[PDB]
Amino acid sequence: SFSGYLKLTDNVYIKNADIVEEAKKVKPTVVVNAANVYLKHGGGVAGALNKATNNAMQVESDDYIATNGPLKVGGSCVLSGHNLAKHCLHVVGPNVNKGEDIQLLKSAYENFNQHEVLLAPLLSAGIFGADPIHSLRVCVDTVRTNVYLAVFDKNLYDKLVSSFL
Numbered sequence: 001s002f003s004g005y006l007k008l009t010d011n012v013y014i015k016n017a018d019i020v021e022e023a024k025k026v027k028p029t030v031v032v033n034a035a036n037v038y039l040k041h042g043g044g045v046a047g048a049l050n051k052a053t054n055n056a057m058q059v060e061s062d063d064y065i066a067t068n069g070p071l072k073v074g075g076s077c078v079l080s081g082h083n084l085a086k087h088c089l090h091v092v093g094p095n096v097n098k099g100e101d102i103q104l105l106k107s108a109y110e111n112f113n114q115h116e117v118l119l120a121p122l123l124s125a126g127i128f129g130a131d132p133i134h135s136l137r138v139c140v141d142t143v144r145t146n147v148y149l150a151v152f153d154k155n156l157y158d159k160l161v162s163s164f165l
């Protein structure tokens with residue numbers, strides 16, 4: 001199962017790791033993708049996860065969007081996990097750099113409650129523009145299921161652990 005995680009709360013764990021390498025190693029039931037409403041996995045965690053699937057995630061995602069239309073900000077969809085996980089839970093956190101509402105971050109984390117265990121990044125962190133400290137606080141106060149957070153940046157991981165309340 002998951003190794004080397006630091007326990008933050010009863011159900012939230014954190015590790016300084018590349019979520020792609022973590023998914024390839026664990027092959028969890030669910031890997032969370034930091035998705036946008038269009039499932040266009042061009043960069044960030046989405047681009048990295050999609051690149052690890054040899055673009056199979058993008059091909060599947062385009063067929064999903066062609067059939068269903070875009071997701072809502074704060075929403076999600078379950079697609080294949082390809083070579084990374086059984087499933088990929090594509091969750092759309094608000095992108096502050098695209099001027100989206102940061103109040104939707106709690107709704108985005110509520111999607112995690114539909115899965116008993118998940119490997120996930122911090123929603124809306126990184127290129128999505130939100131404060132990762134705020135994202136971790138929303139995560140621990142919203143997610144009740146077992147969430148194993150992978151934080152790519154070592155320096156951010158240390159800041160997140162050292163400032164955790």
Ligand SMILES: CNC(=O)c1ccc(S(N)(=O)=O)cc1
Nearest residue numbers: 018044045048125126127152
């Ligand atoms: C392999 N990982 C990445 O390329 C990666 C990791 C983290 C980010 S973030 N969420 O923007 O800080 C983007 C991309």
